[PDB]
Amino acid sequence: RPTLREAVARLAPGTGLRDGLERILRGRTGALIVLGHDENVEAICDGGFSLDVRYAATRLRELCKMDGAVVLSTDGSRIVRANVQLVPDPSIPTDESGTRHRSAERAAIQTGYPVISVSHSMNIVTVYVRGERHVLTDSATILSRANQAIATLERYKTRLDEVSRQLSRAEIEDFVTLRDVMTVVQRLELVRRIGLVIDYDVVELGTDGRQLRLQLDELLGGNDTARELIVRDYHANPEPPSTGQINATLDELDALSDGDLLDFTALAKVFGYPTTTEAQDSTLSPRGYRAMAGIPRLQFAHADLLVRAFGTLQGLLAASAGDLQSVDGIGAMWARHVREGLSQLAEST
Amino acid sequence: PTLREAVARLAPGTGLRDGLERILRGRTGALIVLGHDENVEAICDGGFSLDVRYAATRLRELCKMDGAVVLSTDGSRIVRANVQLVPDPSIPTDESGTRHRSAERAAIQTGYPVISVSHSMNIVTVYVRGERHVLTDSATILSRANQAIATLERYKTRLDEVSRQLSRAEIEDFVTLRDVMTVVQRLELVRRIGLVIDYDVVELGTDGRQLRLQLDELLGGNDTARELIVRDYHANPEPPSTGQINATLDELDALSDGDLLDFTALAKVFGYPTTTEAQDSTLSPRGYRAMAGIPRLQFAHADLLVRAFGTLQGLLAASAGDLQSVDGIGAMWARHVREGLSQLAEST
Amino acid sequence: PTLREAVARLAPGTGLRDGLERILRGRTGALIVLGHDENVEAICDGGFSLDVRYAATRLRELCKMDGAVVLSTDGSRIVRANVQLVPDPSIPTDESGTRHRSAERAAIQTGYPVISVSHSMNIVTVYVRGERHVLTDSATILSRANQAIATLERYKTRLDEVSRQLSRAEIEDFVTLRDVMTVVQRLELVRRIGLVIDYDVVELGTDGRQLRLQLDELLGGNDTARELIVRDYHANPEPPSTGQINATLDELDALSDGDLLDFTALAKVFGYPTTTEAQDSTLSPRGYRAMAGIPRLQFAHADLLVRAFGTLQGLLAASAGDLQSVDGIGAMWARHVREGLSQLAES
Amino acid sequence: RPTLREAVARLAPGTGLRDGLERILRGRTGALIVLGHDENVEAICDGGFSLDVRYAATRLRELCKMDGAVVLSTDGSRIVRANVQLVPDPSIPTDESGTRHRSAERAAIQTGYPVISVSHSMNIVTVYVRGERHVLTDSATILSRANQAIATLERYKTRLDEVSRQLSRAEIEDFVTLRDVMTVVQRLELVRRIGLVIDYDVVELGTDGRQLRLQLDELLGGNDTARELIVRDYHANPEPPSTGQINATLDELDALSDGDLLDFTALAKVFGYPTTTEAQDSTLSPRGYRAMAGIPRLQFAHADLLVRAFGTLQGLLAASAGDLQSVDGIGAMWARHVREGLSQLAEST
Ligand SMILES: Nc1ncnc2c1ncn2[C@@H]1O[C@@H]2COP(=O)(O)O[C@H]3[C@@H](O)[C@H](n4cnc5c(N)ncnc54)O[C@@H]3COP(=O)(O)O[C@H]2[C@H]1O
Ligand SMILES: Nc1ncnc2c1ncn2[C@@H]1O[C@@H]2COP(=O)(O)O[C@H]3[C@@H](O)[C@H](n4cnc5c(N)ncnc54)O[C@@H]3COP(=O)(O)O[C@H]2[C@H]1O
Ligand SMILES: [Cl-]
Ligand SMILES: [Cl-]
Ligand SMILES: [Cl-]
Ligand SMILES: [Cl-]
Ligand SMILES: [Cl-]
Ligand SMILES: [Cl-]
């Protein structure tokens, strides 16, 4: 069945449905619309007339001038019933108020399809999707909220970049501590979560979100890769993290509450380090996956064999060119390319 | 309850504010008592007694009826609806109309907040014991507050610029009253706009959560800066007492916005002459600001050094051994202070 | 009075505007006369005579009634309500309808402002002696003004960049007339946008308080910069007198928007020839702008030094002792100026 | 006869017509207005009053209080009929909804003049011109759309500046590649295209767009010159590109689709380089137009003479003041000026 997020996109600006709903609001008639029709919807439909017409925003507005509910086909392409009386099972729980909205949420739960009720008194559109509710919001209000969020994301992007530069500099110096790594982890997560908030606003804005999508893609882009590499570099298990294990760790980070992300001990637990104060002060050593990823055209197969042999970035830097040609599966030309790239880390700082 | 407390109870994100927004869209009007006891019952006439949990939808429906709705003190319950309030007509009020005059009188007599919604004006007014506040749409508040935050970040840049100028002048040993009062004015301007933004943030409720973090970051350190500059350049010859510092800052707040534009007005608060020649006369900081820049240096240590040497220049000429001669300053701290002072001089 | 004075009297935050806002929400319409004398009484017909203190609520309630409300000149009292205005029909007007045509005719005949509120259009119009102004909701003005602020921030950025280029040229001793006038154009462009936004602040009244803080900070120092550039690059060999400086600034304001794009028109205001060949001729700064760049140096001191040495190059080559034998400059300010100048050259 | 874009201009803010339409919307009367009168319009006109009065916003509002349609003269200066019943040929096809709007578009097609319908229920203005339709939008909504675009244009302008500075660094070092040149070409085009979008909003805004016009011209200022200079520097033709050749290249760039702009090989084709991915790594040598433009006070006329004489930026850097004063039209003063201006770039990067 459609999910709450799917319904929100289907009612977003730029869609045929949203054009009809905008028309209904201006007419102040109210409405009750079922986004789907099957045998289950028929069971709760009572009376009304059957019509078979192509969906049109103008047609929807006219039919919703009538008392009752309008039913659309599942694909949303046709209007099949109008002036219908919904009779959903009263035992289905709902916290809505009044016959119209209580009938709407109950019908949404019983049939499994989205149901829209528009209040003539309040000029509000509500969509019910299987026990969840979404209230449409003015595109101006969403834009104002999203642009402030974009402003916060730009600041999160600036602080992320500088703490990231500090971490890399410490990696060369061999003076990285667990707390420093969790400072970068915290900033990557903060960037990700505010990014998700803006993403939901972009979806809700529909065509009115096109420009916001472009801004969001630049600010975020590369956030997923940075989170994956940092888990790959600083995870407590002696074995280099598997790709699936990395996704498990990242999923644990997402499970943390917004408040927990401010707690460096909680993050330390997600990477397998102890939660103690002393653990934060302890010095770590990067595994080196991030450095290899920066080397152009170096397939991860060659990076995993080298990282497994030497273990740490300092071991990779301490290796000679011949030491990088004595690893099984690494060529002579590849050994030269990796050694030169690590020397460019000296060029970095 | 205070008026600001009442405004918080009606702020966005509360059940009450949800109900009031619904009432406004219904254009029904309302007259709501936020509390119930024997005194309220005395002024209640007719109506229904009911015992239901508060809900925005329930409040909207009940206010469709003529009369008033009374809630429990905690706001969790609706206890009566359709009530006729009859507060003592002798209680004075300058409100207009039966509903609003009855609302303010009821607020005064019972001591609880009373809300009246005008169907004609679509305005929410809350009365708390002779004071009034009219709600403002969150949209207007957000736009107004964002200009204020934008201006405040710019005032914060200007404050940093004049502060570095003062520190450089302090090291150079050529500081004039005018240079100090430029910093005093910028500190106060940041503070006052900060207070303005704070009131809007409170009124915004949940819609002010993001703006609150921005405000706390921009302001942070303003109180310490105001205390320190008073402590360094106050006319009183003995270093200012904690009570004197708090008194001066209260006087600075008492000045009008126009007075903050008058450097002579600021100089009077600091105890200096109001003449124009005073703005040009030189002064010497005590050194509290410099010591505060020293990491890990407890204020108690800085106070002993300032009383011994008297001025920042006396501290800068003091050797590390010379700073182990005052009782209460150890050898390690003495090296740490001299090292810090020499670093401070080079930076300017 | 004037139309601008009336708009101030009707600005947000005033008792009058509060009543008008209440009338607009009530959608009753209104016809209000801001003044009472014999000429008004001649035009008043029927109605009730009352003498009450003005309050926004009182104006709203009285304007629910058909007819017109008359206020005292100072605006402190309501003197008539439900009155019929009967201005001389020979008085010409291009307004539409009985109410608005009666409003303008009454404004012309009596000389006081007259306000009409349209129930159909929910628009407030004030008539002052043959002129018309329509009040605008504070939201619309704020949006209009913020667009102007966006332009102003870009113009301030362009002004800062060209100003730093000019100052760098002053140190290099190779400054041309066209360079100076490039800064002159950008200073004027910033000013003109500033004037437009300032007008929106006035109409906004109390709703413009935040826009005033933002506007004053962005403009801040622009008037001072316009004075300093005139003081540095004005034809007259003697440093321009305060009367000459104000005259130059007044001529710039008189220029049309189109003239500002032409540097030769700007050159004329400063007393230089309009020929393009002149735009390539090198100039010598007096040093007012450079001295203004020195932190903490008040213009009293800066002016004494600039008048003594004559040119910025003379200031740069002066020792600390050379800047102490100018009466009015002590040892401390002479040293501070010497160091401040060396910083500019070194950077 | 009026075209769709021309008609929208006649209804733009600041016009007498748009003032009248704004009055109609506030009055909630609805309207049906024909912008033109000839034999064909009269043919479809039925009943009503014939009047000859000058157009005024107020006069239009009052006349539209009556049932029916108002006809204006072709020049728009007069109101010629009111209370008219339009009877367009019903065979003319239309997909509009309702008697008023379907009658409006049919009349627009049959007579060839613009026709305006105002919905009393929806408070929406639609203009029909020969099978095309446009719905007017409140100036606030257009401004909101345009300010989002201005924000993106601010991000593209910053990104353009940084890659341009990177290209400038490479030009001095003589380590430029096609990929470096095409990164700047792409960023120049993105700024240009978003700028064109904002320009259309300025036109639709009429007088309400004057400030947006000032801001837009400031941000876009210099973008055209940058596009010309980069073509002048890195065009595959051996001789410096011709003026018509430059115009041809920029026209091809405009012809590219948005997706093609994301293809560096697509941009390489326009400049005349090979379309292969390998070609992106080939080294290029700039002619020096861009660097000379960075020199203060240097008129392009003189830079064109120097660039054609020496051929490459590296040749210009190696040139002495005497070498730069042997080009006709380059004096001693300008030879010195360019000589120091180039040696300052060499040191800075
Ligand atoms: N001598 C005349 N010639 C032609 N048409 C006439 C007229 N007198 C009245 N009307 C028409 O009757 C409408 C309603 O007039 P009423 O006196 O009810 O309502 C009036 C009255 O309450 C007030 N108003 C208009 N002119 C006034 C004046 N000179 N003095 C006082 N009140 C005035 O404004 C209301 C609406 O005026 P509006 O012009 O919109 O609407 C006017 C106008 O269209
Ligand atoms: N032949 C027909 N077939 C089916 N339904 C019909 C019809 N003629 C009228 N109606 C219905 O009656 C409504 C009111 O018609 P009325 O002529 O009063 O009000 C009309 C008339 O004043 C004007 N209008 C519509 N078509 C026109 C035309 N061809 N020429 C001139 N005026 C027109 O616009 C008003 C509103 O039009 P709208 O369609 O919204 O509203 C129409 C439409 O819903
Ligand atoms: Cl629509
Ligand atoms: Cl709501
Ligand atoms: Cl009220
Ligand atoms: Cl109000
Ligand atoms: Cl009359
Ligand atoms: Cl329609």
Q: How far apart are CA A33 and CA A81, in angstroms?
A: 10
Contact present, B335 and B320 (Cβ < 8 Å): yes
Residue B256 per-residue DSSP state:
-
Give the technique used to solve this structure.
X-ray
Q: How far apart are CA B126 and CA B108, in angstroms?
A: 12
Cα D286 to chain centroid, rounded: 30
Residues 6+ apart with CB under 8 A from A183: A163, A167, A264
Coil, strand, or helix at residue D74?
coil
Q: Are strands A45-46 and A31-35 parallel, antiparallel or unpaired?
A: unpaired
From C28, C69, C99, C104, the mutation candidate for ligand 1 (largest count of ligand atoms within 8 A of CB) is C99
Coil, strand, or helix at residue A132?
strand
- Find chains touching chain D: ≥3 CB pairs under 8 Å: A, C
Contact present, C60 and C23 (Cβ < 8 Å): yes
Mutation pick from B147, B189, B277, B280 vs chain C, by most beta carbons of C within 10 Å, is B147
From D63, D99, D110, D120, the mutation candidate for ligand 2 (largest count of ligand atoms within 8 A of CB) is D99
Is chain C adjacent to chain B, meaning 3+ CB pairs within 8 angstroms? yes
Q: How far apart are CA A104 and CA A34, in angstroms?
A: 8
Q: Which residue has the tokens 């300052």?
A: D344
Q: Are strands C77-85 and A31-35 parallel, antiparallel or unpaired?
A: unpaired
- Partner residue opposite D121 with nearest CB, options A27, A212, A215: A27
CB D122 to CB A23 under 8 A?
yes
Cα D189 to chain centroid, rounded: 13
Q: How far apart are CA C158 and CA C165, in angstroms?
A: 11
Q: Are strands B124-128 and B44-45 parallel, antiparallel or unpaired?
A: unpaired
Contact present, A180 and A167 (Cβ < 8 Å): yes
Tell me chain A's radius of gyration from C-alpha atoms.
Answer: 28
Supply φ then ψ for residue C235, to 5 degrees.
-50, -55
Q: How far apart are CA D174 and CA D346, in angstroms?
A: 11
Q: How far apart are CA D42 and CA D38, in angstroms?
A: 6
From C43, C45, C70, C98, the mutation candidate for ligand 1 (largest count of ligand atoms within 8 A of CB) is C98
CB C26 to CB B120 under 8 A?
yes
Q: Does A141 touch chain B (CB under 8 A)?
A: yes
From D100, D109, D122, the mutation candidate for ligand 2 (largest count of ligand atoms within 8 A of CB) is D100
Q: How far apart are CA C260 and CA C271, in angstroms?
A: 16
Q: How far apart are CA D15 and CA D125, in angstroms?
A: 15
C-beta neighbour count of A238 within 10 angstroms: 6
CB D122 to CB A208 under 8 A?
no
- Partner residue opposite B210 with nearest CB, options A97, A141, A148: A148
Q: Which residue has the tokens 């007509």?
A: B89
Q: Is C67 annotated as a binding residue?
A: yes
Coil, strand, or helix at residue D46?
strand
Q: Which residue intervals of D256-331 are DSSP H helices?
A: 258-261, 264-271, 289-294, 300-310, 313-318, 321-324
A78 strand-pairing partners: A54
Q: How far apart are CA D228 and CA D300, in angstroms?
A: 12
User: Nearest 5 degrees, angle CA B143-CA B145-CA B151?
Assistant: 110
Is chain A adjacent to chain B, meaning 3+ CB pairs within 8 angstroms? yes
**Smallest-distance ligand from the CA of C99:** 1
Supply φ then ψ for residue D265, to 5 degrees.
-70, -35
Q: How far apart are CA A94 and CA A131, in angstroms?
A: 8
Q: How far apart are CA C185 and CA A85, in angstroms?
A: 71
Amino acid at B113: P
Tell me chain D's radius of gyration from C-alpha atoms.
Answer: 29
Contact present, B281 and B327 (Cβ < 8 Å): no
CB C120 to CB D212 under 8 A?
no
Q: How far apart are CA A177 and CA A282, in angstroms?
A: 6
Q: Are strands D31-35 and D115-118 parallel, antiparallel or unpaired?
A: antiparallel
User: Nearest 5 degrees, angle CA B335-CA B339-CA B343?
Assistant: 170
Max CA pair span of chain A: 85
Distances (CA, A) of C205 to B132, C9, C145, C191, C208: 22, 10, 13, 21, 5
Q: Is B210 exposed, middle or buried (0-12, 13-18, 19+ CB in 10 A)?
A: middle
A126 strand-pairing partners: A117, A135
Q: Is D81 exposed, middle or buried (0-12, 13-18, 19+ CB in 10 A)?
A: buried
Q: How far apart are CA D65 and CA D314, in angstroms?
A: 76
From A187, A188, A192, A164, select the one nearest A176 (Cα to Cα): A164
CB A208 to CB D98 under 8 A?
no
- Partner residue opposite B25 with nearest CB, options A121, A141, A148: A121
Contact present, D85 and D43 (Cβ < 8 Å): no
Contact present, C54 and C77 (Cβ < 8 Å): yes
Residue whose Cα lies nearest atom 40 of ligand 2: it is: D100
Tell me chain B's radius of gyration from C-alpha atoms.
Answer: 28
- Per CB-CB distance under 8 Å, the chain C contacts of D153 are none
Q: How far apart are CA A237 and CA A287, in angstroms?
A: 11
Q: How far apart are CA B338 and CA B320, in angstroms?
A: 6
* H or E segment and range at residue B174: none
Tokens representing B201 are: 């943030």
* H or E segment and range at residue D85: strand D78-86
- Per CB-CB distance under 8 Å, the chain A contacts of D133 are none
Tokens representing A103 are: 């009938």
- Could you list the beta-strand ranges (E) of B100-233: 114-117, 124-128, 131-134, 175-176
B304-326 in b/e form (b: 16+ CB < 10 A) is ebbebbebbebbbebebeebbee
Tokens representing C216 are: 């004053």
- Partner residue opposite C150 with nearest CB, options D58, D215, D297: D215
Provide the number of CB pairs (under 8 Å) joining chain C to chain D.
34
Ligand 3 center–CA A86 separation, angstroms: 28
CB A122 to CB B57 under 8 A?
no
Mutation pick from C120, C158, C160, C176 vs chain D, by most beta carbons of D within 10 Å, is C120
From A28, A6, A3, A202, select the one nearest A17 (Cα to Cα): A6
A116 strand-pairing partners: A33, A127
Q: How far apart are CA B289 and CA B287, in angstroms?
A: 5
CB D26 to CB C122 under 8 A?
yes
Tokens representing B241 are: 């007492």
Q: How far is A276 from chain B (nearest CA, A)?
A: 25
* H or E segment and range at residue C60: helix C56-63
Amino acid at B74: D
Q: Does B198 touch chain A (CB under 8 A)?
A: no
Tell me chain C's radius of gyration from C-alpha atoms.
Answer: 28
* Packed helices B242-254 and B222-232: angle between N→C axes, nearest 10 degrees: 110
Mutation pick from C140, C147, C173, C276 vs chain D, by most beta carbons of D within 10 Å, is C147
Q: Is D301 exposed, middle or buried (0-12, 13-18, 19+ CB in 10 A)?
A: exposed
Q: Is D159 exposed, middle or buried (0-12, 13-18, 19+ CB in 10 A)?
A: middle
Q: Are strands A78-86 and A49-54 parallel, antiparallel or unpaired?
A: antiparallel
> What dihedral do alpha carbons D265, D271, D272, D273 form, nearest 10°?
-50
- Residues counted in chain D: 349
Tokens representing A299 are: 């397939």
Q: Which residue has the tokens 């503070």?
A: B191
Supply φ then ψ for residue A33, to 5 degrees.
-120, 135
The DSSP line for A281-349 is HSB----SHHHHHHSTT--HHHHHHHHHHH-SHHHHHH--TTTTTSSTT--HHHHHHHHHHHHHHHHH-
Residue whose Cα lies nearest atom 3 of ligand 1: it is: C98
Look at phi and psi of residue A185 and say left if phi exceeds 0, alpha if psi is from -120 to 50, else beta. Answer: alpha
Q: How far apart are CA B265 and CA C145, in angstroms?
A: 33
Q: How far apart are CA B114 and CA B6, in angstroms?
A: 10
Max CA pair span of chain B: 86
Coil, strand, or helix at residue C45?
strand
Contact present, A228 and A234 (Cβ < 8 Å): no
Contacts 24+ apart (CB under 8 A), A254-258: A256/A189, A258/A193
Q: How far apart are CA B332 and CA A212, in angstroms?
A: 57
Coil, strand, or helix at residue B147?
helix
Residue whose Cα lies nearest atom 17 of ligand 2: it is: D67
* Packed helices B331-347 and B138-172: angle between N→C axes, nearest 10 degrees: 100
> What dihedral do alpha carbons D315, D318, D321, D322 form, nearest 10°?
-70
Q: Residue D114: CB within 6 Å of ligand 2?
A: no
The DSSP line for D312-324 is SHHHHHH--HHHH
Distances (CA, A) of A19 to A10, A104, B323, C313, D268: 11, 21, 78, 70, 43
Tokens representing C327 are: 């009466």
Query: Does the CA dihedral C3-C8-C14-C18 come out positive or negative?
Result: positive
Q: In D, residues 25-64, which contact C (CB 8 Å cutoff)?
A: 26-27, 56, 58, 62
Q: Does B18 touch chain A (CB under 8 A)?
A: no
Contact present, D331 and D325 (Cβ < 8 Å): yes
Look at phi and psi of residue B51 and say left if phi exceeds 0, alpha if psi is from -120 to 50, else beta. Answer: beta
**Smallest-distance ligand from the CA of D34:** 2
Ligand 3 center–CA B136 separation, angstroms: 29
CB D26 to CB C147 under 8 A?
no
Residue C85 CA, closest ligand 1 atom number? 30
Distances (CA, A) of B323 to B284, B335, D33: 20, 8, 92
- Per CB-CB distance under 8 Å, the chain A contacts of B58 are 97
Residues 6+ apart with CB under 8 A from D208: D13, D14, D139, D142, D143
Can you give the resolution of this entry in Å?
2.9
From A103, A127, A124, select the one nearest A115 (Cα to Cα): A127
Q: How far apart are CA B238 and CA B266, in angstroms?
A: 20
Mutation pick from B20, B21, B23, B25 vs chain A, by most beta carbons of A within 10 Å, is B25
Ligand 1 center–CA C172 separation, angstroms: 74
Q: Which residue has the tokens 């909003």?
A: D201
Query: Does the CA dihedral B301-B303-B308-B312 come out positive or negative?
Result: positive
From C108, C70, C74, select the one nearest C92 (Cα to Cα): C108
Coil, strand, or helix at residue A217?
helix
C-beta neighbour count of B89 within 10 angstroms: 10
Residue of B nearest to C215 (CA): B151
Q: Residue D83: CB within 6 Å of ligand 2?
A: no
Q: Which residue has the tokens 């407390």?
A: B5
CB A59 to CB D97 under 8 A?
yes
User: Nearest 5 degrees, angle CA A210-CA A213-CA A219?
Assistant: 155
Q: Is C172 exposed, middle or buried (0-12, 13-18, 19+ CB in 10 A)?
A: exposed
Residues lining ion ligand 4 (Cβ < 5 A) are B 21
User: Nearest 5 degrees, angle CA A239-CA A241-CA A243?
Assistant: 145
Q: How far apart are CA C97 and CA C120, in angstroms?
A: 12
- Partner residue opposite C121 with nearest CB, options D26, D215, D296: D26
Tokens representing A263 are: 């707690």
Residue of C nearest to B158 (CA): C217
Contact present, D295 and D335 (Cβ < 8 Å): no
Q: In B, residues 231-270, which contact A (CB 8 Å cutoff)?
A: none
Contact present, B26 and B64 (Cβ < 8 Å): yes
